[PDB]
Amino acid sequence: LLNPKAESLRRDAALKVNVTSAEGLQSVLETNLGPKGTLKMLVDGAGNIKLTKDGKVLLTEMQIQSPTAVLIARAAAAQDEITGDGTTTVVCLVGELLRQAHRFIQEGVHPRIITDGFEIARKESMKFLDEFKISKTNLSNDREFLLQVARSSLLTKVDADLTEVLTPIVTDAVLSVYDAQADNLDLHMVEIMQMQHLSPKDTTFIKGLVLDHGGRHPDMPTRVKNAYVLILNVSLEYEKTEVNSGFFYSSADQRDKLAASERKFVDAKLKKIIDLKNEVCGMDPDKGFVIINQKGIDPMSLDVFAKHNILALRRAKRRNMERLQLVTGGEAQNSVEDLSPQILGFSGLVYQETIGEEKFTYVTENTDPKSCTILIKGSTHYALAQTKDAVRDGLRAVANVLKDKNIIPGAGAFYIALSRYLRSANMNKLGAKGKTKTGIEAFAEALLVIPKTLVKNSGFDPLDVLAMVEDELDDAQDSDETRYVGVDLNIGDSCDPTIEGIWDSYRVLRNAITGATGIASNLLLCDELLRAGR
């Protein structure tokens, strides 16, 4: 029953290849799970190296041959637009769900029976999550907790030494842009900027913006305690006539004097700019004056500005000009003819940093910058890439907690406790079917792939860490107390995640469980593998 130039898998082979493919993808990405996981290398085929642990990066930048694993990779990657994290978790859950389902299918359990059991477990799992979570204090001033959130996110991605550097940077950068009166926040208010010639441990938080083009005169101020900012769109390069003209001279003296006569047009504009400076804290102590001109500035006029203790920047990018208007509070002057103090903004400490190859201008300490900058440093591409991802991952982790006050103790406490819950509730309720229970049992066991994979990577015995957690949980249940028990991936024994400071996000756990259940079900329900024209 087959047309030429086509192929199909009709018998159970369709399921074996779907499970096998998923098992492959699992066996790769499981090694990236947890702070003790390994680091994957990507080669772009052109000779460039990028290193990452991030599930989304691994799935979206690596090519996959197995058409079934492609479906898992895409569905898991979609989580990036929903939670921003948990991609590796989903792949691990899907793999083990298909492993456990396969074990039962071999016994004659129809894929539908497992699928329905998964849906029953999913609905009860969401109930468990809602009762398992802890409500976070609604105060945004809780820096101590927010550090724990950023730390937990960073430890997954960096070498744990950069965690000490990045943790306060992620925490304060997000809290700084967090709106007052307990409102929402947009983490796009934090600029992610890379620079070279410094070690990755030098990554730093900048209160304001950092500009690329600096001053180009040796007498430009190095640092000004407080300055007014002129936002100017008018070119200060040597101007020529707008109409047909020329320089007609009988002597070298007349030649240059005629050129100077046209140059006076720029000097007149400079006078109005300098006169403004003279009016607004002209000679006041501990004051200065900064120009961030959108257009070019003549080397002649840079000499003028430097002599007047003015820090003159030129050829600013639009993105900097628009942001600097917001940060400094000034307005863009389209014509020097209307120049007045009303144009000026204000900034605090303004200074330039000199790097072997580049200069960077800092416009920090503003009344309300409504923006932060993080400077990600390194000597290599892969070092900058890994650190950049670690910063963006932390910023999303903290922002998600500030938006969603629901926090869940981590270190596997959710997944082990949920597995125990489902096993008990299923027999207490019996609300599915005598055979459907096989799907729920498969689900409850599959949940343990996370605490098992987390510890497998740590190098501790996966069998003891589970038993130890079970022992402590049993004591809590017999004592009629609430106790959150996880695994300490540094010691190997159990721990209370709420003392260690290991937290998961509600959004991540909610969608990771729902997604993995759907993905595994979509593969289990596949009756035939069709191939035509390929």
């Binding site: 086509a6 035509a532 024209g533």
Partner: protein
């Protein structure tokens, strides 16, 4: 190149069995998924029987016939796509031992199949139950069956109402001994046109009774509505008037161009004054309208719409009452817009509309769909079409057939008993249909996860001794009554399904030779 004889017969049945197999497990509320690998490297898991058959390449002409068969089913009845393909294939499979091993000539098998169709159609009627296709509430309960687990299920009262008003408007509900019974002729393809307009929400959908134009006018800014409309439908253009001669206008001297413009100005004004004699509110001209003509008519407080084809005016006249005339001097004082509440020129989503609705139903309607995005509008349109399809299928005949495999099982049992009285060579292939019908209740069991023999045997016993309304529970896999578990389907689906399935089998059984050539 060429395949003949039993090799052609086996090839035709084999290919048909393959196509049926492709979607065999895609039937039922618990349909399985199918992984389709695209030549371009992608893949989908769709369980949509239409897409699966569409997106799979076939070689054998017999398989291509089955693909076109499904297209025919879709045009005739809004459902039954997969039932026809599965049944048609199984019939050919059941005819296989008779065509090849028993050496029964195709002409005998085809004749037996035609008789099996006749008997099967009568059985489907016998097991049906009536519905009152005049009771809107009863119809809403049936129509919702096509809306469940769709986005718009939360507004299903509006989706049903639109389907009820649209179908009943076009339904020919008549019976007499003169013209005869139309059998509730319904056309939801052309006479219920659906249009998607940005803005609003699902509940804001409306049904129009009249004509809606999308053509813009000379002055987009017009009174919100006209309470006393008068519409002019005129062919003659409003431009320089020429005679019946072949005389051309040729101007060489620059000063002489004024002679033609001055003549046109007088002639155009006089034509426009004749139009304004009847105090219109909307003037529609089929030919061109000169710039001067647009000003002469507009300045009087009247909308002007130029270059409108006769095919539009013929419909506009039915809902406005305006007479279509050739010459401007043929316009009548009776050209009015009475028997109408108002004409509306409201712009929706920065798009101009002209609503020519009145108090009459010109055997047709148009449905306005509303929504906050194109995605919402598309979901409303697709889901409404399902509501209209099932509304048509039910209002086409006041009868439902029991689902869950019940009807197909009843046909099998009744054909098997009828076979006992059908002495002769035809008795053998006749049974082929009775066995083929089982492919539906068998598939439902296979998806449920039960034993295809033990559960079917229980079903057959229930039909043999009990009622014909016994079927398979989609969720539990148990043999249950379709009275408690309604699962009722419009009879037209079961009648067309067995009709088209057997006819297709009869076609391929007739082909003992496939010959290439141009």
């Amino acid at each position: 190149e060429r395949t003949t004889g039993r090799q052609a017969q086996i090839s035709n049945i084999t290919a048909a069995k393959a196509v049926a197999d492709v979607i065999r497990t895609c039937l039922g509320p618990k349909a399985m998924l199918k992984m389709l690998l695209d030549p371009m490297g992608g893949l989908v898991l769709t369980n949509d029987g239409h897409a699966i058959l569409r997106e799979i390449d076939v070689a054998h002409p017999a398989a291509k016939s089955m693909l076109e068969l499904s297209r025919t089913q879709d045009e005739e009845v809004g459902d039954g796509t997969t039932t026809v393909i599965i049944l048609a294939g199984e019939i050919l499979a059941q005819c296989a031992p008779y065509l090849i091993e028993k050496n029964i000539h195709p002409v005998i098998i085809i004749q037996a199949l035609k008789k099996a169709l006749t008997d099967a159609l009568e059985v489907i009627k016998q097991v049906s139950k009536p519905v009152d296709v005049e009771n809107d509430a009863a119809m809403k309960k049936l129509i919702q069956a096509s809306i469940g687990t769709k986005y718009v299920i939360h507004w299903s009262e509006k989706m049903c109402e639109l389907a009820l008003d649209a179908v009943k408007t076009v339904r020919k509900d008549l019976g007499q001994t003169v013209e005869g019974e139309p059998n509730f002729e319904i056309d939801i393809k052309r006479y219920v046109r659906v249009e998607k307009i940005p803005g609003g929400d699902v509940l804001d959908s409306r049904v129009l009774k009249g004509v809606l134009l999308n053509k813009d006018v000379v002055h987009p800014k017009m009174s919100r509505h006209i309470e006393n409309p008068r519409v002019v439908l005129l062919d003659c253009p409003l431009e320089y008037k020429k005679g019946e001669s072949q005389t051309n206008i040729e101007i060489e001297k620059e000063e002489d161009w004024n002679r033609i413009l001055q003549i046109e100005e007088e002639q155009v004004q006089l034509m426009c004054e004749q139009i304004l004699a009847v105090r219109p509110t909307l003037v529609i001209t089929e030919k061109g309208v000169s710039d001067l003509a647009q000003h002469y008519l507009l300045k009087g407080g009247c909308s002007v719409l130029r270059r409108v084809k006769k095919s539009d005016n013929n419909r506009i006249a039915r809902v406005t009452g305006a007479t279509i005339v050739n010459r401007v001097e043929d316009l009548k004082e009776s050209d009015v817009g009475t028997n109408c509440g108002l004409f509306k020129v409201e712009m929706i989503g920065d798009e101009y509309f002209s609503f020519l609705d009145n108090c009459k139903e010109p055997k047709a309607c148009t449905i306005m769909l509303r929504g906050g995005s194109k995605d919402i509008l598309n979901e409303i349109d697709r889901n409404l079409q399902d509501a209209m399809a099932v509304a048509r299928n039910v209002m086409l005949s006041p009868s439902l057939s029991p689902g869950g495999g019940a009807t197909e099982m009843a046909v099998s049992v009744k054909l098997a008993e009828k076979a006992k009285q059908l002495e002769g060579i035809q008795q053998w292939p006749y049974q082929a249909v009775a066995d083929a019908m089982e492919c539906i209740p068998r598939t439902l069991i296979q998806n449920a996860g039960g034993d295809p023999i033990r559960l079917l045997s229980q079903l057959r016993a229930k039909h043999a001794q009990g009622n014909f309304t016994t079927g398979i529970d989609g969720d539990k896999g148990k043999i249950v009554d379709m009275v408690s578990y309604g699962i009722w389907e419009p009879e037209v689906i079961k009648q067309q399904s067995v009709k088209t399935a057997i006819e297709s089998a009869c076609l391929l059984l007739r082909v003992d030779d496939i010959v290439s050539g141009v």
